[PDB]
Design an enzyme around this catalytic site. Structure first.
Site, PDB file in Angstrom:
ATOM      1  N   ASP A  25     -79.235 -25.758 -20.615  1.00 26.84           N
ATOM      2  CA  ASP A  25     -79.113 -26.238 -21.988  1.00 26.84           C
ATOM      3  C   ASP A  25     -80.285 -27.143 -22.377  1.00 26.84           C
ATOM      4  O   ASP A  25     -80.303 -28.337 -22.053  1.00 26.84           O
ATOM      5  CB  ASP A  25     -77.788 -26.970 -22.171  1.00 26.84           C
ATOM      6  CG  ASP A  25     -77.561 -27.374 -23.613  1.00 26.84           C
ATOM      7  OD1 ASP A  25     -78.377 -26.936 -24.454  1.00 26.84           O
ATOM      8  OD2 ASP A  25     -76.592 -28.106 -23.906  1.00 26.84           O
ATOM      9  N   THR A  26     -81.246 -26.577 -23.108  1.00 27.49           N
ATOM     10  CA  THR A  26     -82.373 -27.355 -23.616  1.00 27.49           C
ATOM     11  C   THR A  26     -81.948 -28.361 -24.670  1.00 27.49           C
ATOM     12  O   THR A  26     -82.703 -29.296 -24.959  1.00 27.49           O
ATOM     13  CB  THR A  26     -83.439 -26.408 -24.179  1.00 27.49           C
ATOM     14  OG1 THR A  26     -82.890 -25.647 -25.266  1.00 27.49           O
ATOM     15  CG2 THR A  26     -83.912 -25.467 -23.097  1.00 27.49           C
ATOM     16  N   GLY A  27     -80.767 -28.195 -25.247  1.00 27.42           N
ATOM     17  CA  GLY A  27     -80.239 -29.133 -26.200  1.00 27.42           C
ATOM     18  C   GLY A  27     -79.444 -30.275 -25.601  1.00 27.42           C
ATOM     19  O   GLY A  27     -78.862 -31.063 -26.353  1.00 27.42           O
TER      20      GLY A  27
HETATM   21  C1  LIG Z   1     -78.026 -36.644 -26.778  1.00 28.83           C
HETATM   22  O1  LIG Z   1     -76.980 -35.804 -27.081  1.00 28.83           O
HETATM   23  C2  LIG Z   1     -76.866 -34.680 -26.215  1.00 28.83           C
HETATM   24  O2  LIG Z   1     -77.743 -34.257 -25.561  1.00 28.83           O
HETATM   25  N1  LIG Z   1     -75.499 -34.068 -26.219  1.00 28.83           N
HETATM   26  C3  LIG Z   1     -75.261 -32.887 -25.497  1.00 28.83           C
HETATM   27  C4  LIG Z   1     -74.691 -31.857 -26.486  1.00 28.83           C
HETATM   28  O3  LIG Z   1     -73.604 -31.883 -26.973  1.00 28.83           O
HETATM   29  N2  LIG Z   1     -75.660 -30.764 -26.764  1.00 28.83           N
HETATM   30  C5  LIG Z   1     -75.348 -29.640 -27.733  1.00 28.83           C
HETATM   31  C6  LIG Z   1     -76.355 -29.755 -28.886  1.00 28.83           C
HETATM   32  C7  LIG Z   1     -76.245 -31.149 -29.497  1.00 28.83           C
HETATM   33  C8  LIG Z   1     -77.295 -32.225 -29.167  1.00 28.83           C
HETATM   34  C9  LIG Z   1     -77.177 -33.607 -29.784  1.00 28.83           C
HETATM   35  C10 LIG Z   1     -76.016 -33.908 -30.695  1.00 28.83           C
HETATM   36  C11 LIG Z   1     -74.971 -32.827 -31.011  1.00 28.83           C
HETATM   37  C12 LIG Z   1     -75.089 -31.445 -30.413  1.00 28.83           C
HETATM   38  C13 LIG Z   1     -75.561 -28.313 -27.104  1.00 28.83           C
HETATM   39  O4  LIG Z   1     -76.882 -28.159 -26.565  1.00 28.83           O
HETATM   40  C14 LIG Z   1     -74.572 -28.089 -25.932  1.00 28.83           C
HETATM   41  C15 LIG Z   1     -73.147 -27.812 -26.407  1.00 28.83           C
HETATM   42  C16 LIG Z   1     -72.380 -27.375 -25.179  1.00 28.83           C
HETATM   43  C17 LIG Z   1     -70.948 -26.733 -25.525  1.00 28.83           C
HETATM   44  C18 LIG Z   1     -69.768 -27.686 -25.948  1.00 28.83           C
HETATM   45  C19 LIG Z   1     -68.411 -27.094 -26.266  1.00 28.83           C
HETATM   46  C20 LIG Z   1     -68.187 -25.595 -26.169  1.00 28.83           C
HETATM   47  C21 LIG Z   1     -69.349 -24.667 -25.741  1.00 28.83           C
HETATM   48  C22 LIG Z   1     -70.724 -25.261 -25.423  1.00 28.83           C
HETATM   49  N3  LIG Z   1     -73.120 -26.694 -27.380  1.00 28.83           N
HETATM   50  C23 LIG Z   1     -72.654 -26.850 -28.756  1.00 28.83           C
HETATM   51  O5  LIG Z   1     -72.196 -27.849 -29.199  1.00 28.83           O
HETATM   52  O6  LIG Z   1     -72.830 -25.633 -29.492  1.00 28.83           O
HETATM   53  C24 LIG Z   1     -72.038 -25.471 -30.751  1.00 28.83           C
HETATM   54  C25 LIG Z   1     -72.825 -24.874 -31.630  1.00 28.83           C
HETATM   55  O7  LIG Z   1     -72.863 -23.321 -31.136  1.00 28.83           O
HETATM   56  C26 LIG Z   1     -71.672 -23.082 -30.629  1.00 28.83           C
HETATM   57  O8  LIG Z   1     -71.754 -22.545 -29.250  1.00 28.83           O
HETATM   58  C27 LIG Z   1     -71.272 -23.471 -28.398  1.00 28.83           C
HETATM   59  C28 LIG Z   1     -70.409 -24.476 -29.280  1.00 28.83           C
HETATM   60  C29 LIG Z   1     -70.905 -24.446 -30.483  1.00 28.83           C
HETATM   61  C30 LIG Z   1     -74.353 -33.153 -24.279  1.00 28.83           C
HETATM   62  C31 LIG Z   1     -75.173 -34.008 -23.227  1.00 28.83           C
HETATM   63  C32 LIG Z   1     -73.054 -33.859 -24.676  1.00 28.83           C
HETATM   64  C33 LIG Z   1     -74.033 -31.786 -23.611  1.00 28.83           C
END
Ligand SMILES: COC(=O)N[C@H](C(=O)N[C@@H](Cc1ccccc1)[C@@H](O)C[C@H](Cc1ccccc1)NC(=O)O[C@H]1CO[C@H]2OCC[C@H]21)C(C)(C)C
Lengths: 99, 99
Positions: A25-27
């Site tokens: 996860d690059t995010g």
């Molecule tokens: C500094 O903050 C961070 O680094 N926060 C991280 C964080 O949340 N990162 C997300 C992007 C992000 C960055 C900063 C602020 C808010 C959102 C993203 O990269 C990973 C999540 C993982 C996931 C969670 C539940 C179900 C399935 C997958 N994916 C997601 O939310 O995706 C949405 C949109 O698409 C859809 O698919 C999947 C769900 C739906 C951390 C560390 C908490 C993981």
């Protein structure tokens, strides 16, 4: 290797003697793993994403092997729905985005 | 280009004729942008992440240019903490992970 993004980029990791599937996860700033019973000391942390924050346990200098590539860093544990490998460890394995 | 991950992979996007900064996010299935006025028809939806679910407006077949690469696809608009480019559009611009 090269990982396309048609599907979630899940790979096998090894941590605390267990094999698990985890999302590259690059995010993600941090690495967050589903609830598991790692030994040693930890510190409370709050991490935030879409929807709000969750409470996690922060473990330091934890070894994770990601597709045969070893990395050592901070690993968070808590009620995440998916094991997430974040930038803190992806940099250690030389992972890049390319287009 | 090739992008390393020691910093957040933020890029400039153009959508609705407006420029914005967005996070290249391999851990997101979908693209979710902060509240904005977008031309076109939309439908109400909800999307879930770490922390819970948020209410969004789904816009389909939206033109968006990501770091000089054009995509046309679904964009969710709502109270996300960060603009995130998810795999639905990362695939359109030919993005892969490599290590
Ligand atoms: C500094 O903050 C961070 O680094 N926060 C991280 C964080 O949340 N990162 C997300 C992007 C992000 C960055 C900063 C602020 C808010 C959102 C993203 O990269 C990973 C999540 C993982 C996931 C969670 C539940 C179900 C399935 C997958 N994916 C997601 O939310 O995706 C949405 C949109 O698409 C859809 O698919 C999947 C769900 C739906 C951390 C560390 C908490 C993981």
């Amino acid at each position: 290797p090269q990982i396309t993004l048609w599907k979630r980029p899940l790979v096998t990791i090894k941590i605390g003697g267990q094999l698990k599937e985890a999302l590259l996860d690059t995010g993600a700033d941090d690495t967050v793993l589903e609830e598991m019973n790692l030994p040693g000391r930890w510190k409370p942390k709050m991490i935030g994403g879409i929807g709000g924050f969750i409470k996690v346990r922060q473990y330091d200098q934890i070894l994770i092997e990601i597709c045969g590539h070893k990395a050592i860093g901070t690993v968070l544990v808590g009620p995440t729905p998916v094991n997430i490998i974040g930038r803190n460890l992806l940099t250690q394995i030389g992972c890049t985005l390319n287009f």
